[PDB]
Amino acid sequence: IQKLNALKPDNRIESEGGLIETWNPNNKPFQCAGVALSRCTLNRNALRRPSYTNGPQEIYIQQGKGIFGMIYPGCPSTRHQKIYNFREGDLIAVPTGVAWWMYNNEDTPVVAVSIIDTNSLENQLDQMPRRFYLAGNQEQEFLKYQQGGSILSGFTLEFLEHAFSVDKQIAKNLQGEKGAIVTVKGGLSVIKPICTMRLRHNIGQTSSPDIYNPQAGSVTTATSLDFPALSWLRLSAEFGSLRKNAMFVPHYNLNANSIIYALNGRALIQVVNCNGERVFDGELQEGRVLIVPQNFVVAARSQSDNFEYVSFKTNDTPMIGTLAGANSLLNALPEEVIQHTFNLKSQQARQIKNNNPFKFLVPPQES
Amino acid sequence: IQKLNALKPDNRIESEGGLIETWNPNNKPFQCAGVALSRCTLNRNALRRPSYTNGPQEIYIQQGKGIFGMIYPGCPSTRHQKIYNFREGDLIAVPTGVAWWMYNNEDTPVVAVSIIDTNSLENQLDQMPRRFYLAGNQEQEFLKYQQGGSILSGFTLEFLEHAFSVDKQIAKNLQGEKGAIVTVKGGLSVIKPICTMRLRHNIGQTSSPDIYNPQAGSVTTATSLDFPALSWLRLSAEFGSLRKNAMFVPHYNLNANSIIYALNGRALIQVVNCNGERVFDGELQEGRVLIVPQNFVVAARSQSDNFEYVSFKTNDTPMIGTLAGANSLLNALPEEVIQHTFNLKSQQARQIKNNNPFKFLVPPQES
Amino acid sequence: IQKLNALKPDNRIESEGGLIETWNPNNKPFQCAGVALSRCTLNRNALRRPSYTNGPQEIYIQQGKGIFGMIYPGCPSTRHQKIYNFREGDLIAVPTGVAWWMYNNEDTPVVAVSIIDTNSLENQLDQMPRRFYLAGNQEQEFLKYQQGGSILSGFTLEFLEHAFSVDKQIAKNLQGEKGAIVTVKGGLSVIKPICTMRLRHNIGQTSSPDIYNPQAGSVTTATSLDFPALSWLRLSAEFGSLRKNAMFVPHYNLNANSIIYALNGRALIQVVNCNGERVFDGELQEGRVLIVPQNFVVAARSQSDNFEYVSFKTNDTPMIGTLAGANSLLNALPEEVIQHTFNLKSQQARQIKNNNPFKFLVPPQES
């Protein structure tokens, strides 16, 4: 790739109580990353209908409070299986093929941006995304990219009558006859709170930052160490809040692919490749995404009082190699290999290893 | 997949003591599937000569009894390494690159239908199925599909001469100069009985079933839980025997592809995809196979008194989501969300949950 | 593959303090094996500047003595992380992404040959070899195949300024303002003795060999049982020394590709495929590389006094299946079945089983 561009969605699907936005998974960034991105927003009383995908999915909630519930095959009911609550900041984990449903109850919408790792090992189909809905007669979000009905409507009435042991009339209602997101007139009176596994860990409205710098921002990461349902996914996530003109240092992921989606405000990012080319040099704003491939190096300087972002890294234990600051790779170098690979005096080399005391987040220059 | 079809073979190879038939790997079903199917039948006194593929193999024995022996490199002998017996319903696990031979001695022929997963992490070559014979001049079963002799008959007359430490004459014998299934005139007088790992497990008719229902039939599953050599393969198999007009309810496999080879009888099968499209609506009869991709939904009604099948799943521990039955996905949903995704009333949603009290097999409708 | 051949390199770069050669990764043999070979060389007082790749690397030192550093991300300093010394006959293991530098102080020019497994599961990018130089203005070894400056020079002056917290005078030095391998004029004052695990193991002649035949030679191999860091790499290596006219028997790797680099001398190798076609017959001589795929079979007779080779296998625990020897597959086959596959008398079967008593190495034929 010669030029990474900030990408917008190219597909909106307005449902009765919501909206689904999907990004084109065949632009070379998304081809390379091997994920498909989606932003679902569901209004008051909306109930996203039960569905599943042929790959690992990890959902980040940008705003809202609802209930969500996953129908796991080998699992015990309570009537019905476990319903979890959520808040903005929560990272939801969805194992391959597991069917889920989500519902909102307040005025403030649920906006939940999320990625499908189409390129996962668990995805024994092809690199195309697919959602398999259990209900309704509607085009699945990604059918456009391939080139409607639920997985139950593609059956024969005689087959559905026999399977459920119900009469023809009710069997007709299963068989199709509002989109994926439906509005509940009366609102669900369904109780507000591996089958044992926690699949909800908050990296937004926390107060326990991985890194926290009162002069520059704060950053948090959910890896499997602290959110073990993520070893199932082999997926990760980072949330970082950045003050105006603070910066996160040049770094690269050794073992992963970052899909940086910007939640708030804006920042000027720079990403340079193996040949030293500056494959993107611009600004990333709200509701826009930048994919940063594996060993490529990104550096950002903020433009807003708090430029927030969720970076979905594809690896449940991602590793970053900081190139400037407290724990950098140049710090860990002998003071004389730096002198000869950079062509620096002994005096200077020291400054390049100690002028910035800060780990990852470096404060605003002050001018 | 546009349309799935009940595939038969496109390759008969008749040898002295038996027959090998293979199914085309370049068909779109097998290409998605990632498998290579084949069915070898050995007659009385026949010896399938030692060979090996570059991927995980899983052999099911449709009928007959005989013996088979692995030639595992890191092992102790006795004279010779271990030879095992086999009955019908035996599932033999063969690790990547291990060699083996199989012999029959009855009048009843061994019919062993098997799959090589050519899309394995273990297969480090290409998607093309191939078999490497130690002995005998003959072309390999999948030479047909690429576009001969065995591996030993390719070296120089003096390289075997030098290697085995023998003369020109028996070097010419080892050097090639009846195909893969030769008949052993008198009979192999070898006694009828990881190195220690049990590569045999009976899933067939002489088993203790997983689902059993005397009005509808029974299912039996060999995951890696119960047959531990299968976690080496990363392959599974399943046996079913449905009563006439009994059905297995619509279900999908969360994490595996299935290759349903029908062993006995006939059945009316139906599979639907992500867009509610009925990709197969027909009959799978004996000696035919139907590939059901990853999150595709499958349901079948039996048309025989006892329709029997083998289902090679491609995952050593497959999970199936049942869409109807005691433990269905719909059974674990809140009654109220079942009303709102399918447009039912409370009463009807009491029925989709409770009209069928059965797990996986549902009895004949009984009219 | 139709035919194989002994390959010499196509690309060579003269750097100030040494040289770098790279084999073309887009040959059909290299696309099949899935690896990229480079042979670098450090003359005296040379530093190889910090670099890193999107894949698991395994460097084998052919000749010389020197030291090297590995800049691991999480790892603790000492002033800087822990340095290791290498001497010839060594194998150094470099995890995906880890940056490393390499120095030479003797006159004796360090020659190391190495692979990058671009087909790894850690390699999330594509099938391209690509080195990320941490400093200096030079075009990367592999760029040519793709068709410069470092990851630091592509960045902006003020981004580098603010990043490192420096003055603009040393930020411009730092911004790249003598190639990969640069001569330290005085030569480093730096000493000569997962953050603590061993990443060096010696498989040269100094080592205790696995096989030692005083008339034939010796074979030493490092798996992840004896060099555990290689389980990270999912790679291994194997050194071989063979007297004139001796032979390593016909054999096949069950689970790995093989990259034979001819260190010293010249032998005559034969590799035959699954059809019986001798896809290579002729001589692999010094500084040349023969790729030998997964279940393909190889035999070789040494034509020099002591032909020396390193075999880069693509598996940390490769299993080999030898075709003639003490330990052979034929040995484990009952005398009777080996009579019938090869068409031999009983007494001619015992000759195959017993004449050659040596494991892997068979002496000269004695003429």
From Swiss-Prot, chains A, B, C:
The keyword Transmembrane does not apply. SMART domains: Cupin_1 (SM00835). One of its GO terms (molecular function) is nutrient reservoir activity. Keywords: Allergen, Disulfide bond, Endoplasmic reticulum, Seed storage protein, Signal, Storage protein, Vacuole. Emulsification efficiency of glycinin is improved by degree-dependent glycation with soy soluble polysaccharide (SSPS) at 60 degrees Celsius in both the acidic (A) and basic (B) polypeptides as a result of subunit dissociation at the quaternary level. Thermal treatment of soybean seed proteins leads to the aggregation of glycinin acidic and basic polypeptides (GAP and GBP, respectively). GBP improve sensory properties of meat (e.g. pork) during chilled storage and inhibit bacterial growth (e.g. L.monocytogenes, B.subtilis, E.coli and S.enteritidis). PROSITE patterns: 11S_SEED_STORAGE (PS00305). It comes from the Eukaryota. During soybean germination, seed storage proteins are hydrolyzed by protease/26S proteasome. Exclusively in seeds during embryogenesis. Transmembrane segments: none annotated. It is found in: Endoplasmic reticulum; Protein storage vacuole. GO terms for cellular component: endoplasmic reticulum; protein storage vacuole. Belongs to the 11S seed storage protein (globulins) family. Hexamer; each subunit is composed of an acidic and a basic chain derived from a single precursor and linked by a disulfide bond. Interacts with the vacuolar-sorting receptor VSR via its vacuolar targeting signal. This is Glycinin G1. It comes from Glycine max (Soybean).
